[PDB]
Amino acid sequence: GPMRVFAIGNPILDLVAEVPSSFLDEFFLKRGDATLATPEQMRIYSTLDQFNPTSLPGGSALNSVRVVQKLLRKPGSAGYMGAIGDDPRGQVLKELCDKEGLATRFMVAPGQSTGTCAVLINEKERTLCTHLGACGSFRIPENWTTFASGALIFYATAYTLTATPKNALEVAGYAHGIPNAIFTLNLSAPFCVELYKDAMQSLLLHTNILFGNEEEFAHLAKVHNLVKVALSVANKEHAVTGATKLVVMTRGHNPVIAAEQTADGTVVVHEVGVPVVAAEKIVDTNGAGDAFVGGFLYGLSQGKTVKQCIMCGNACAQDVIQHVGFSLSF
Ligand SMILES: Nc1ncnc2c1ncn2[C@@H]1O[C@H](CO)[C@@H](O)[C@H]1O
Numbered sequence: 640g641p642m643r644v645f646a647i648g649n650p651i652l653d654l655v656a657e658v659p660s661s662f663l664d665e666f667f668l669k670r671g672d673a674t675l676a677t678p679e680q681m682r683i684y685s686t687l688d689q690f691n692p693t694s695l696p697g698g699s700a701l702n703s704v705r706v707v708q709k710l711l712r713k714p715g716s717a718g719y720m721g722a723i724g725d726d727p728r729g730q731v732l733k734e735l736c737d738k739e740g741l742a743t744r745f746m747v748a749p750g751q752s753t754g755t756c757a758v759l760i761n762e763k764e765r766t767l768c769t770h771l772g773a774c775g776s777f778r779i780p781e782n783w784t785t786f787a788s789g790a791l792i793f794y795a796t797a798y799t800l801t802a803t804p805k806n807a808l809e810v811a812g813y814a815h816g817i818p819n820a821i822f823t824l825n826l827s828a829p830f831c832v833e834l835y836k837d838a839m840q841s842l843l844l845h846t847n848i849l850f851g852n853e854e855e856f857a858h859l860a861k862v863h864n865l866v867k868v869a870l871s872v873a874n875k876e877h878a879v880t881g882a883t884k885l886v887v888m889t890r891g892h893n894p895v896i897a898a899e900q901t902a903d904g905t906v907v908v909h910e911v912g913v914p915v916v917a918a919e920k921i922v923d924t925n926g927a928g929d930a931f932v933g934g935f936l937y938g939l940s941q942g943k944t945v946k947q948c949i950m951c952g953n954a955c956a957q958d959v960i961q962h963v964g965f966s967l968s969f
């Protein structure tokens with residue numbers, strides 16, 4: 640059907656820039672980290688101009704559904720919901736999506752500024768500093784299921800829990816009632832895993848596919864019980880007819896580890912190898928995961944196998960890290 644994937648997320652505007660470490664320390668930031676801007680960190684948004692920053696659509700899930708749409712081609716092949724501000728920024732972000740053919744229904748938070756992310760590039764590492772703004776006002780509308788009518792793949796990032804666990808919870812609870820419908824979620828960041836414990840727990844029980852990276856899965860493991868492969872197999876209990884129960888754990892250049900529980904409690908795990916990419920060819924790792932999940936969901940809606948799904952993602956991620964931040968044409 641037209642709409643293959645449906646996702647909710649935080650539509651934010653990205654401000655990219657290569658900055659010196661001295662910058663990281665002045666704005667009390669840890670290289671590689673991802674966090675919400677503090678009051679003393681609100682200054683970065685301005686002071687960035689002295690670094691000829693670049694600007695473009697951001698938002699984890701937005702990027703993912705974006706990869707989907709591009710590969711699916713048809714308009715509204717991927718639908719998306721979220722909240723932008725009633726400012727010029729949100730208009731630009733919205734115009735961009737439409738130009739892509741993405742089906743979207745954005746909610747506007749009057750008097751609020753669209754969210755912005757300071758993507759700090761130092762070394763090859765990416766440092767994310769965000770100010771959600773309007774994003775925190777996201778509320779899933781009374782007719783969402785009608786808008787995303789026919790989609791069998793529903794996606795949501797943990798980043799969305801900051802506004803309210805309700806959104807994902809709601810979306811998650813809908814797909815679960817739909818036979819053949821699957822719910823997928825991303826750990827987004829250590830902090831999500833760390834702050835949305837209780838809610839995360841309830842949503843997990845409804846997740847058919849869980850995505851994340853070593854770092855997040857590690858925090859996940861510790862918080863809950865369980866505390867690579869073990870962490871991965873550990874997480875599968877939290878989710879645990881036979882409706883798909885898969886957990887994909889990415890590990891930078893190391894093999895991707897995927898563990899799934901079959902209808903008969905049989906556990907099958909796969910360690911997928913990542914094709915070598917010379918260090919020098921690597922530009923940055925910003926948007927790597929998003930590119931990965933995108934490839935995955937694409938192949939998924941295509942009926943390919945997990946391993947095969949893991950391969951498409953690897954490809955997408957690979958193309959992207961060989962470009963300055965997130966890029967769209969493959
Ligand atoms: N709190 C957040 N919620 C949603 N997306 C985020 C968050 N902070 C960073 N991002 C997005 O993560 C992307 C990188 O995966 C960037 O495009 C950035 O816009």
Ligand SMILES: Nc1ncnc2c1ncn2[C@@H]1O[C@H](CO)[C@@H](O)[C@H]1O
Nearest residue numbers: 889891892913916927928931953956
């Ligand atoms: N150092 C790296 N070398 C090769 N691929 C990488 C590296 N870091 C990240 N990736 C790719 O990005 C994905 C998400 O981190 C990985 O699954 C992998 O495909």
Ligand SMILES: [Cl-]
Nearest residue numbers: 708709710712
């Ligand atoms: Cl196209």
